[PDB]
Design an enzyme around this catalytic site. Sequence first.
Site, PDB file in Angstrom:
ATOM      1  CG  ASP B  74      -0.238   0.062   2.532  1.00  0.00           C
ATOM      2  OD1 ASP B  74       0.771  -0.654   2.710  1.00  0.00           O
ATOM      3  OD2 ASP B  74      -0.689   0.830   3.409  1.00  0.00           O
ATOM      4  CD  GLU B 131       4.256   1.015   6.781  1.00  0.00           C
ATOM      5  OE1 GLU B 131       3.888   1.833   5.912  1.00  0.00           O
ATOM      6  OE2 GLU B 131       4.884   1.353   7.806  1.00  0.00           O
TER       7      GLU B 131
END
Lengths: 470, 472
Positions: B74, B131
């Site tokens: 991400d 994350e």
Amino acid sequence: LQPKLLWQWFDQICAIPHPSYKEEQLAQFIINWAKTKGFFAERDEVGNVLIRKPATVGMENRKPVVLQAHLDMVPQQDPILPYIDGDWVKAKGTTLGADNGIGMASALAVLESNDIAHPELEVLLTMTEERGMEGAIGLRPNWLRSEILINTDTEENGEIYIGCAGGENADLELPIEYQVNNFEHCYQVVLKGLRGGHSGVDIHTGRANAIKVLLRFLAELQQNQPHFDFTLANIRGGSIRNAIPRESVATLVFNGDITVLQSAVQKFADVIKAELALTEPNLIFTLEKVEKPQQVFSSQCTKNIIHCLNVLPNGVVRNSDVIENVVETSLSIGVLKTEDNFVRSTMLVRSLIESGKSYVASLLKSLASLAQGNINLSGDYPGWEPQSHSDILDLTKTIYAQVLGTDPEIKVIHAGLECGLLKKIYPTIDMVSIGPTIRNAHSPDEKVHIPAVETYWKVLTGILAHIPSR
Amino acid sequence: QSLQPKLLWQWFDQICAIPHPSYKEEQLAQFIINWAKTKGFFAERDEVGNVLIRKPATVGMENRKPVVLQAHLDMVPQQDPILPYIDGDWVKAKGTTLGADNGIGMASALAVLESNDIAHPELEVLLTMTEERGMEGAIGLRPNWLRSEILINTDTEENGEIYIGCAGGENADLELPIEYQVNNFEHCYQVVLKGLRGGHSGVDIHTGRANAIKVLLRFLAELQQNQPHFDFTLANIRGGSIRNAIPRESVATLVFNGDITVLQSAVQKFADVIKAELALTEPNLIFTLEKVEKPQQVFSSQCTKNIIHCLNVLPNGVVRNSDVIENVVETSLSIGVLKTEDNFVRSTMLVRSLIESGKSYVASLLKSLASLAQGNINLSGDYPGWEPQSHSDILDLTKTIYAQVLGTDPEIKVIHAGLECGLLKKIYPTIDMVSIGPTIRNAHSPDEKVHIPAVETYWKVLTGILAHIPSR
Ligand SMILES: [Zn+2]
Ligand SMILES: [Zn+2]
Ligand SMILES: [Zn+2]
Ligand SMILES: [Zn+2]
């Protein structure tokens, strides 16, 4: 011990008791001595000593110079007993007075001498530097004829100070409400064995404040152990406003097993030791049974006092962006005391800039409001801002580098010198601060490096020999 | 798809093509798995959705310790594709965040998988979920799943730097109650502070950067302490955008009686003070004073005073510098957002420390504040730090390769920011871990950029390490 004149003067300075409000005997002795040499000698309304001596032959068209030192020493009215250790000098079980007695002796050594080149000379010895700088504050203006001032109150060989922090005392009072004591137990949580330090020069370090570390424990305890039914009976720590506290104590009354308290102390002791390890090797928590008071704080009072003092700002507030490796703004709480109906916290706010001080004062007044206590501000003094340019610094650097063989360091200190106050009264005077290495001033650990005093002398006299034309 | 190393950049270009913001990772994850499978690689996802790909050792690398390369799937969006381009020696997105964090590391791991002429041992590529919004992937990673004995985290963002440690973190939200009154004051103006630098609340907290929220609160506090005859109350108060960004703007709406010039003067004097204090650090700071529509209801004065003084006292910035490590902040916090909601003022903070007890201390501080102010602290998103290993063979090798590639020695540091390594090492204690990566600037900011020759140097270090991993 060489240089004779400086050290004979220091020996004499030690002989006359001269703590931070008994300056008269030394002040009068020095005036008398000056007059027997035919020197002009005067004291201002506030009691600052001013001696004058004419230029030495060939030095007459050169800028007049005042060597400035403070009369008084920290007592933490009977005489001082010094001795030579190795390359050091110290007082037998007390503060030596090397701060600022060596600077002062050197100024008088010059006055006494007949083979040191100097311009038209003033020697200004100020009152009560060490207790709110009363001398510097009430120095008569348009009094000194000098164009240059050499403050001799720096305490590190090879360093020239051109600036310092201003200061302001802040006292926080928090109300105490009591209840009748109906608790089963009474124990003191005792914290001891922290390094301590000077709340200015050591504030940058990782050193810990004992008052604040205890309050950290108590806050965590109250927050995390809601079924531990207790209240404060009293609380204290530290000794002096500008010293980092080394001991603190809270008396606690509580119900239930003593082991609950014991375990909380232990787990916290072990956490804090992990955190501070190298920085605070001797930190010790103890848990000591004590006589049960008839009255104790109310539960609400305890929560307000714990949470206020835990949030209480302490230590470095801001580091300087302009100057390298210098704390710009700090504060430190040096004493905590439980009085009748108030808990009193005693703090010194420091900053290089006036607005940093006022900002901290804003924070404290915000805290006090949230906590329904009150702040009292006193003892405000200005910092010493580095000059845009200085001819005396140029010369001082030149000479120091000649004497040392390496370049000296030019710094500003995060502590109080009188220079900010002096430059306030004498803006056109070009000012610098120097002095030999003195360790652990304000404390009975006070030591003065012997050869640094010699190097200092050569630099002092070297500067005096070479002050330029008007 | 132009620049070299081709495979890495072609992969990065592909990664940008697939919108993959920090909760829409599905399309990318599925694109990677299917692609993996077309190459005959083992490809799996765990319960949480972390991607694991496996590839055998290259010929001659069979007795060598297995390695996993880890990156996170991400990027931060502060559902449409990304438009990158080559500026000079830099790559940027067309008016948005690029995703170089952590897309370049991810590209490089995929390029290695794709290659047929780069030496490497038995290989894993672990791509973690989410994350940037709480390390949900790393938290929920399947244990006894990875066969690798070495992990190379690719989430570092500075050339010539090897990270062996990092801060843990915890979200702290403080709510303070609002009580209102009918507005019968003569005027309504907003005190607008804009033009501050901002920054990342971890990596930039050691600097002398100011916080827009905290500076406004300082003004407001001083005004109330020093101007007792200035009759005012807050109408509302806000600042910042995101928890881990240093705030660059803030606004208070004030209603008040008497001359507008009293408030003009108080701002002007404060603006002049602060401009002097922050000369070097904040050259673009501007206070303005802007007339606004008069609300029907406003805070009570007791409320205005509680919220002004709570939030002035509120700890912000460096709480403690490390003693054991050189030039690294040990514990900090930063207030990133302030908002006025129905009946509460909300303050949104990230607490960081290298040690757990530093986080809990700051938590305690905040809970003491909230007690005094009669509000509430909510804690969430706690994650552990990454404590440097007593010894690391992969560091030694990393150190050697980097020194060969650069010519000078690399810097070995611990960073005051969040990496997943703390969490991964939590779940996989026996894996030898290290973090490297190419120079990326202004990650999370739409100014995000990646230095092209750094990505080429990073490639040589990565491939050099993979080529020299020792025997089991
Ligand atoms: Zn002193
Ligand atoms: Zn002194
Ligand atoms: Zn990121
Ligand atoms: Zn990342």
